[PDB]
Amino acid sequence: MQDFRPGVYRHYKGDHYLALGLARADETDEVVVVYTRLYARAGLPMSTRLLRIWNETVDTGAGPQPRFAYVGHVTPE
Amino acid sequence: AMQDFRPGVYRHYKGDHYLALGLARADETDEVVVVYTRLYARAGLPMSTRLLRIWNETVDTGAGPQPRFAYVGHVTPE
Incomplete structure (x- = not known):
């Protein structure tokens, strides 16, 4: 709870989301x-x-990955 | 129902206001x-x-049927 950081996240499947x-x-x-x-x-x-x-950390064909990874307040091209 | 939903300020039937x-x-x-x-x-x-x-949903307290949440626009009361 306390350590959650709202902002831009990348889902392990590739798409960006704004928390x-x-x-x-x-x-x-x-x-x-x-x-x-x-x-x-x-x-x-x-x-x-x-x-x-x-x-959660999720098992994928690419190995272990965070389900949603924090990347800051902006998204890439 | 989705199509008729209007985001904004709502007054819950108990008196408090919320921003949808x-x-x-x-x-x-x-x-x-x-x-x-x-x-x-x-x-x-x-x-x-x-x-x-x-x-x-509609609710009925001690004053008759009324919306659980009533839309009142984009501002709260004074």
């Missing part, structure tokens, strides 16, 4: 991350996700 | 939720999320 901050999910009283996608696709641009899941 | 920033998709459940911030002093996380269908 606006943490929030309390009313139905379960759990801490979620509120974020918007920084790429074009169809559907709702904003999403939420449990902080504990967002912070 | 917009709609969001909860990643785990794929449910549609409202992202909002409280506009009054209290301890805790200022932002919250709540299912759109619950946010849109």
